Each structure stands twice: as structure tokens, then as C-alpha cells.
């Protein structure tokens, strides 16, 4: 069946556009990440890292 979205349908019956994202982990190395300055490395320093 078709929704037949009309302006009259009003705030209750309005048509929304939806997008949904799924995130999975551990099964492979990371490939895509948000903007986060990448830094260099340090050895034998007891650092907290990402």
C-alpha cells in the first residue's frame, strides 16, 4: 500500500526521512574513523594511547 503523503496529513502523518548506521568491531582491523589528529609514537614511556 502507498502512504499518499498530503500536506493536510499534518504533523502527525508527515513523512520523515530516516537513515540508520550500523557499527561492527573485532572482526577486522579499523579502516574508517572520525577526524582525530594522528600523532607519532613513543617507546618505553608508559603512555596512554589510542
Amino acid at each position: 500500500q502507498s502512504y499518499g503523503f498530503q500536506p493536510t496529513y499534518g504533523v502527525g502523518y508527515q513523512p520523515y526521512r530516516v537513515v540508520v548506521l550500523s557499527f561492527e568491531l573485532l572482526h577486522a582491523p579499523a579502516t574508517v574513523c572520525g577526524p582525530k589528529k594522528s600523532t607519532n609514537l613513543v617507546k618505553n614511556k608508559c603512555v596512554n594511547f589510542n
Binding site: 573485532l26 572482526h27 577486522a28 582491523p29
Partner: peptide, 18 residues
Amino acid sequence: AYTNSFTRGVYYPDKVFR
């Protein structure tokens, strides 16, 4: 024809090192 696959087909299930 058929044959016994003795122990073939084992593969590294994950990308982790142990």
C-alpha cells in the same frame, strides 16, 4: 567418487595473533 578429508580445511578464523 568419494574420499576421506582427513584433517584438511582448518583456517585462521580471525585476524588476531595468538
